[PDB]
Design a protein around this nucleic acid. Structure first.
Lengths: 63, 199, 117, 144
RNA sequence: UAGUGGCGAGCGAACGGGGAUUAGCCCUUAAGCUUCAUUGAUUUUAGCGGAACGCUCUGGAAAGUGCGGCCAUAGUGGGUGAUAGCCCCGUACGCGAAAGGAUCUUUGAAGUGAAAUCAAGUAGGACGGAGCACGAGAAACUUUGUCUGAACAUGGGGGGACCAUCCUCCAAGGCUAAAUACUACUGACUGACCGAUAGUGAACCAGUACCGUGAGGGAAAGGCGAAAAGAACCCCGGAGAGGGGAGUGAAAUAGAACCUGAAACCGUAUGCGUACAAGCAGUGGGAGCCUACUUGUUAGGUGACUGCGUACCUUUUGUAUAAUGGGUCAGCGACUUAUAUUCAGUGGCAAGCUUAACCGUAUAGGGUAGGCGUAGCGAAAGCGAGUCUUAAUAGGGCGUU
RNA sequence: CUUGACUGCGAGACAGACACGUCGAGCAGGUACGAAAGUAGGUCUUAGUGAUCCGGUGGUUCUGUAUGGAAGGGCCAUCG
């Protein structure tokens, strides 16, 4: 170990064999305002977009 | 398979002797051997390490002179080397399978080019160079590598002054020194030990 | 492995300063002015390989014009015969015949007064 | 073979083009860096994650999960490599004698990912449902 | 990695493994260590012996050429008039110490260890800090500036708030070698290190000269030749400086400021051009003249006359730009190295592959701790070619020969 | 009537640098209603908004540093 991952990025992006999975934003502290359809479709664990993979796995030290 | 001076064959393996020559592999094992015998003992001084040059040589403006920050800048003739050396190592990693496969590719070409000469046993009695010159001349033989199963003491004391021969054991044989000498003498005990290691 | 570069730099200055031989002043004797002067002389030498083919093409035409008006015909009337007749003879040797073999150039300008087009 | 006659295959070694050696080398004057701005300066590096100043992904998406400390000593074997033990007993220690399982592992569950082959006895080792069937098919047995 | 962190930048364990080293003794008195005195032993402070080549050629000089030998536990050492295993000093390899030093070892001696008797203003606690990877945080554990304050083996501490039950230990007395860190100073060997603007600031009378009140800063400067054989004598000159000879040497345009002796810069000689012609100084065309040669339709020099022609770098939308930089020459001067990692090429092995420290009669071989691969999904327990969700095996995401 | 201003989702699109955003059935939990075909996952449409990190609250099957628990953490819901 002579290369330090961001500890703050490993909290966000867990790595699977399908990619780097993350949770969604807009799911905190203002939730009666939005509809139930917009709280339902952000509740899972999505995947990381192709333009985002290179910036994240330089932070998570994998490039 | 292999033939000897003393009227016999050995029936060595097709594995260790008589395989196919890979020059990309033998080049890598020779560059690896020739670099691990390099000692990286040199150093030059950086601009921090050259003696002096603490203060600025003049004020930043007004003097009509180019910007300087120390007498010991790498542009200045007193200054440090810009990428000054430190003692580093030139050792590199061969795989253990990759050294062995490169030796196994060299021995195959020593057979194929008639540069390998097998004798039944090779022992001198006296610790004397003249006694070993006189025995290599019975084989029509100079600039030789002698590879025995274990180097005995008289065979080492002879031929360690002699100008163009070496006496190695099988463990101590190496890719460069059996591609450098114009002949290699292995005994029949050596081709057994070469097949314990490589086959 | 340190390498000193005084033998390669002096042979590289001496090539560029041999190509500068014959130039006025510091253009032939100091390197910073001779390097620029040899570069410029080979830009001009490139350019004027094209203009040489133009400057002779003008000089041929001007002598053919001058040697045709001796025989009562302009340049452009002499050349005009030959989309109708066909001598297929060029400006380079018609200028050489207008000067030297003046009677064989009179025989060509009467074949062009025979075309009438 | 001579030391004077060895070279590697074409494409094995490359020239290592050096930047900034004249304007014919292709990396003349600037060495692939272009013009002004930080990327051509020395130490001219943009930090990983930095997006010009907006909220980057590692601070804009929520943190989630905990890491289980219960699974640090957990490991999985599969039925392809159960025959690599010796002595017709697959124990926790015997899976460590062959290098199938690290030390500090003390909880092994074996899944089905191939063929068993030999009749092995799995003591003190959990198996899945499709792996217990493929071991008892090949004469295996289970106890603890 | 776990943790930790304006949960930012960052900081960073432990358990468990693989090794290096190998000892534990005591407070009812010990190992161990110091000082002497001795018992053998080993080193160190200097030395001694130390093999084998002649003829020939070129040359100023032979080690080089040519031929023929020899020695070798000594053959790629240093230098000798050019390149030497056999010329010289060495080297391999043996020997050697009046007298000291040092290490190790016998076996006594005085000491010390040593604080007294198994630990009380101590453990614990409250405030405020500091440390533990841990920013006081659920904060354990350790240290303590202030204030307090125990139990006594049918005790007491820890096991990361805390409580019970287990497990494991005995704090408040100590002493302990080796494995480990470093090298101003010695010595030997070594270098894909440097070779006088380099390498130490410093090859030379260098931390000098010089600069500063001072602390402090801090240079430049190597080379005759094999041997001084360093130029007797003569001549001009001011018993000059500096030359012209003669000698010396292989060579003096090796003459001491001395090997080579480049470039800028400054000269003399010769050939051609140039005093009615305007500007990046060249290039295309091109006469005449002058040298060598041989034929002429060449080679070198000069270039009258003429067409076209506003340097270079950098920076810019754009520069002849009256925008930047450069007086010129010669040296020097800017993508490196380490460790992690990703991709490509090229190889070895292949469902496996590879070792790290370390061991090693040492680039070998051993060492597979570990790392990655063979299985994923889930936050996780877990289940596994499958979870989540909901009362819903009902409906989609991820994976899968 | 008095709840479809539903719960689980969701084929497929539109927008789109990313984070966001917009449009959209059938089975059930189950529904108001209509006596029924059926309409209803808010409002004629497009503004009425705010990431993360820290806290707060209610669940939870998850974790729970020897063990049983708790503490703390995670997940889901929601507040500042």
């Amino acid at each position: 170990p002579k290369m330090k991952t961001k500890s703050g990025a490993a909290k966000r992006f867990k790595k699977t064999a399908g990619g780097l999975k993350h949770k969604h934003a807009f799911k905190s502290h203002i939730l009666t305002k939005m509809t139930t359809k917009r709280k339902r479709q952000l509740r899972g664990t999505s995947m990381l977009n192709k333009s985002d993979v290179a910036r994240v796995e330089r932070s998570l030290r994998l490039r | 398979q292999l033939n000897v001076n003393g009227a016999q064959a050995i029936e060595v393996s097709e594995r260790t002797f008589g395989g196919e020559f890979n020059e990309t592999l033998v080049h890598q094992a020779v560059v690896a051997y020739m670099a691990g015998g390099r000692q990286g003992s040199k150093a030059q001084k950086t601009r921090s390490e050259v003696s002096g040059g603490g203060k600025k040589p003049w004020r930043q403006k007004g003097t009509g002179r180019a910007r300087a920050g120390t007498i010991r800048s790498p542009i200045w003739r007193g200054g440090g080397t810009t990428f000054a050396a430190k003692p580093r190592s030139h050792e590199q990693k061969l795989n253990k399978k990759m050294y062995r496969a490169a030796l196994r590719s060299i021995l195959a070409e020593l057979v194929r080019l008639d540069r390998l000469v097998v004798v039944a046993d090779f022992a001198v009695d006296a610790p004397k160079t003249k006694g070993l010159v006189a025995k290599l001349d019975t084989l029509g033989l100079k600039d030789v590598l002698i590879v025995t199963d274990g180097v005995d003491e008289n065979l080492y004391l002879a031929a360690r002054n002699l100008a163009h021969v070496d006496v190695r054991d099988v463990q101590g044989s190496d890719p460069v020194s059996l591609i450098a000498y114009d002949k290699v003498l292995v005994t029949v005990s050596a081709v057994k030990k070469f097949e314990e290691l490589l086959g | 492995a340190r390498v000193k570069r005084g033998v390669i730099a002096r042979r590289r200055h001496k090539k560029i300063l041999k190509l500068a031989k014959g130039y006025y002043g510091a253009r032939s004797r100091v390197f910073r002015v001779a390097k620029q002067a040899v570069i410029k002389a080979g830009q001009y030498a490139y350019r004027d390989r094209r203009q040489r083919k133009r400057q002779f093409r003008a000089l041929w035409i001007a002598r053919i014009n001058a040697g045709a008006r001796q025989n009562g015909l302009s340049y452009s009337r002499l050349i005009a015969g030959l989309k109708k007749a066909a001598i297929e003879i060029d400006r380079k040797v018609l200028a050489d015949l207008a000067v030297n073999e003046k009677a064989a150039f009179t025989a060509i300008v009467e074949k062009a007064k025979a075309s009438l087009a | 073979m001579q030391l004077n006659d060895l070279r590697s295959a074409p494409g094995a070694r490359r020239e290592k083009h050096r930047p900034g050696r004249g304007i014919g080398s292709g990396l003349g004057k600037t060495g692939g860096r272009g013009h002004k701005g930080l990327t051509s300066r020395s130490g001219g590096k943009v930090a990983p994650g930095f997006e010009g100043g907006q909220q980057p992904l590692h601070r804009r998406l929520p943190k989630f999960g905990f890491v289980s400390l219960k699974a640090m000593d957990r490991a999985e074997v599969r039925t392809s490599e159960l025959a690599k033990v010796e002595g017709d007993v697959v124990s926790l220690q015997t899976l460590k004698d062959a290098n199938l399982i690290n030390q500090h592992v003390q909880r092994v569950k074996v899944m089905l990912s191939g063929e068993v082959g030999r009749a092995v006895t799995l003591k003190g080792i959990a198996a899945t449902k499709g792996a217990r069937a493929a071991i008892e098919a090949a004469g295996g047995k289970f106890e603890d």
